[PDB]
Amino acid sequence: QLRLYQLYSRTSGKHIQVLGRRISARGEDGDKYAQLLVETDTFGSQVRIKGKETEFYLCMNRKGKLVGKPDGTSKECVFIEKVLENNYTALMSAKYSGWYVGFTKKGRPRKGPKTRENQQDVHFMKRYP
């Protein structure tokens, strides 16, 4: 299943942007770089996230850095989607368990190794523009 939406960062107050190679969470509602095509496998656990504008996939490299890439074949470009008890959604790397997609209050992306599930930095709400 394919779906289109935006991811609102609990800490940054803005939406995730796939600007190209660079990833950020400073998108106003409706920002063209914040429109995300999200692919969900038949199990419902794993997702690929693609910026609709740039066509770059959101991925996490070995250094734990979030980065956009044109090629989304890598397992670094897959995330496990968890709806938490607090009703936010988190995105854990499928390649690097225990590492999460996250951002600072200024929308700067965080390093996987330095994250964990209970951090607000890694919490998101889904949004249908």
Numbering used by the authors: 51 to 179
Which sentences did the original study use to describe this structure?
Fibroblast growth factors (FGFs) regulate a plethora of critical processes in development. These processes are mediated by signaling through four FGF receptors (FGFR1–4), which are high-affinity cell surface receptor tyrosine kinases. FGF18 belongs to the paracrine-acting FGF8 subfamily, which contains three members in humans: FGF8, FGF17, and FGF18. FGF18 has a number of functions in the developing and adult organism including a key role in skeletal development and has undergone clinical trials for the treatment of osteoarthritis (Merck KGaA).
FGF18 was incubated stoichiometrically with heparin (6 dp) and the complex isolated prior to crystallization in a mother liquor of 0.1 mol/L MES pH 6.5, 0.2 mol/L ammonium sulphate and 26% PEG 5000. The model demonstrates how the extended and hydrophobic β4–β5 loop of FGF18 is important for conferring FGFR binding specificity as it engages the hydrophobic groove in the D3 domain of FGFR c-isoforms.
